[PDB]
From a paper:
In this study, we investigated a donor who developed a family of potent HIV bnAbs with different lengths of an insertion in a critical framework region following infection with two founder viruses that were closely related and underwent extensive recombination. The bnAb lineage is defined by a CDRH3 length of 22 amino acids (aa), an IGHV4–34*01/IGHJ6*02 heavy chain (HC) and an IGKV3–20*01/IGKJ2*01 light chain (LC) gene. A greatly reduced ability for donor plasma to neutralize N332A Env-mutated pseudoviruses of different clades identified the V3-glycan bnAb site as the major target for PC39 neutralization breadth. Ab crystal structures show an extended CDRH1 that can help stabilize the CDRH3.
(b) Ribbon representation of PC39-23D Fab with 11aa CDRH1 insertion. Structures of all three 11aa-insertion Fabs reveal an extended CDRH1 that provides support to and stabilizes the long 22aa CDRH3 (Kabat numbering) of the lineage. When compared to other V3-glycan bnAb Fab structures, 11aa-insertion mAb HCs (17A, 23D and 50I) most closely resemble PGT135, which also has an insertion in CDRH1, while the LCs of these mAbs are more similar to that of PCDN-38B, with an RMSD of 0.48 Å (S12(A) Fig). The glycine at position G100C found in the WIGEL motif is present in the UCA and only retained in 11aa-insertion Abs. This sequence provides a glycine hinge to the unique mature bnAb CDRH3 structure. Most mAbs were sensitive to D325 and R327 mutations, yet only those with the 11aa CDRH1 insertion were sensitive to mutation at every position in the 324GDIR327 motif (S4(A) Fig). This difference extended to gp120 binding, with 11aa insertion variants displaying a higher affinity for gp120s as measured by SPR and an absolute dependence on N332 (S4(B) Fig). A triad of Trp residues are located in the binding site of these antibodies; Trp residues are present in both of the CDRH1 insertions (11 and 4aa groups), but do not appear to be close enough to directly interact with the Trp residues found in either CDRH3 motif (100AWIG(E/D)L100E or100AWWAVE100E) (S12(B) Fig).
Numbering used by the authors:
A (entry chain L): -1 to 27, 27A, 28 to 95, 95A, 96 to 213
B (entry chain H): 1 to 31, 31A, 31B, 31C, 31D, 31E, 31F, 31G, ...
Write the structure that this text describes.
């Protein structure tokens, strides 16, 4: 190719306030440190430049942020995390080779003990069925870490392509995540089948947990 | 300090063209003097987007010379133009699809190797950002939501905790707001981010968990407001026989 790509690690770094965070960036080609930049992104806010041009801090960036590296391997260090530092961080090659691509991001989240989700399944409401569509909802409540797998089965048949997931930001009181998975069927398809099940895999679960209902029972 | 003010319609129909503009404040594009610091010739007026669930993506840039550089993944769908006399620059992205739904930022890129006095921090980076425009690719017209209950049942409450919620379906544009019991019920509530469905309409759910016994002693009502359509809904969520 004719572009430089940057790969960040780890995908998620889980730490406590006061700890040191070390974020890595590997470029696919050598990049001078003159041209390697780092950014912070906090949900709901515009990205912020942290570091650029041979590891220099941008305006307003406090001393706990520093950077290092050469060749293809770069590091952003936060010496002591503050609560406002839990955010997503991006490296970028900026100034030697267009396009000026970013890495894929590293999220720094708040470490806590593993917590399995509580799982709940909801049938389509009779109100909604009066229309032409059925939504079946599976709720994974208050789990940690974020990685989780939800599979839908209809009459024991694995579903694919007809569901969508949404996930909350980490909770400010208990540091967990919550997730919804919504299965969308036509009313006609919904009324043709009996057993609706969501099956959840998570590090906090010894084996997968299935919640199910039988339509009309 | 220099700021970027973003404008332009974020709502684009599939296959049509997105047009966004930023205006520069606190500096001017037509001032060719260079008396201190870095030359305004070293600013590259840039566009960056973030699609949902993805990272930051560099779209391209323009200098007041008129020279552009574009991401090769776009490049004949993308045009960037600058209007030096108006302190403005613009992004046109044609033939949009749902993959182009994203927050679009403009930003000032800086590339200097010469300067007068002290080189301000932020060189060889995107140091000033606009606040972003959320762009939604959809054919939809304004539409208020339907609000359906996510009701607890005997099977789901048998561990001592009940979940209950509201499915807020098929509305456009963003946002809705959701409260429970007129704002009195906040603990254990999770209102999920909306998803832009393939229909071009949004959907989300809001849930709460409570002790199962409180289903016998407490009423639960979700309060849904969609200002764009002047829609307000209160939906009582009852245990389902």
């Amino acid at each position: 190719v004719h572009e430089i790509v940057l790969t960040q690690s780890p995908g998620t770094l889980s730490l406590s306030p006061g700890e040191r965070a070390t974020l890595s960036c590997r470029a696919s080609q050598s990049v001078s440190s003159s041209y390697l930049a780092w950014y912070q992104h906090k949900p709901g806010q515009a990205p912020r430049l942290l570091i650029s041009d041979v590891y220099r801090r941008a305006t307003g960036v406090p001393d706990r942020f520093s950077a290092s590296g050469s060749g293809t391997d770069f590091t952003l260090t936060i010496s002591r995390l503050e609560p406002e530092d839990f955010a997503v961080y991006y490296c970028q090659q900026y100034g030697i080779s267009s396009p000026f691509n970013f890495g894929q991001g590293t999220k720094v989240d708040i470490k806590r003990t593993v917590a399995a989700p509580s799982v709940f399944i909801f049938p389509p409401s009779d109100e909604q069925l009066k229309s032409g569509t059925a939504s079946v909802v599976c709720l994974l409540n208050n789990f940690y870490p974020r990685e989780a797998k939800v599979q839908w089965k209809v009459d024991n048949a694995l579903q694919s392509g007809n569901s969508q997931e949404s996930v909350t930001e980490q909770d400010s009181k208990d540091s967990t995540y919550s997730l919804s998975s919504t299965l969308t069927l036509s009313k006609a398809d919904y009324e043709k089948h009996k057993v609706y099940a969501c099956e959840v895999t998570h590090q906090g679960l010894s084996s997968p947990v299935t919640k199910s209902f039988n339509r009309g029972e | 300090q220099v700021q970027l003010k973003q404008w332009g319609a974020g709502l684009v129909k599939p296959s049509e063209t997105l047009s966004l503009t930023c205006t520069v404040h606190g500096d001017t594009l037509s001032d060719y003097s260079w008396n201190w610091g870095v030359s305004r010739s070293d600013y590259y007026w840039s566009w960056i987007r973030q699609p949902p669930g993805k990272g930051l993506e560099w779209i391209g840039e323009i200098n007041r010379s008129g020279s552009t550089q574009y991401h090769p993944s776009l490049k004949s769908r993308v045009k960037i133009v600058i209007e030096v006399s108006k302190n403005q620059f613009s992004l046109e992205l044609s033939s949009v699809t749902a993959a182009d739904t994203a927050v679009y930022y403009c930003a000032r890129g800086r590339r200097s190797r010469q300067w007068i006095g002290d080189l301000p921090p932020g060189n060889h980076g995107l140091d000033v950002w606009g606040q972003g425009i959320p762009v939604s690719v959809s054919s939809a017209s304004t539409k208020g939501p339907s609000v359906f209950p996510l009701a607890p049942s005997s099977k789901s409450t048998s561990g001592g905790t009940a979940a209950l919620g509201c499915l807020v379906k098929d509305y456009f544009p963003e946002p809705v707001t959701v409260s429970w019991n007129s704002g009195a019920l906040t603990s254990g509530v999770h209102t999920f981010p909306a998803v832009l469905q393939s229909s071009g309409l949004y959907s989300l759910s809001s849930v709460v968990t409570v002790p199962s016994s409180s289903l016998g002693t407490q009423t639960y009502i979700c309060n849904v407001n969609h200002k764009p359509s002047n829609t307000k809904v209160d939906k009582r969520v009852e245990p389902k026989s």
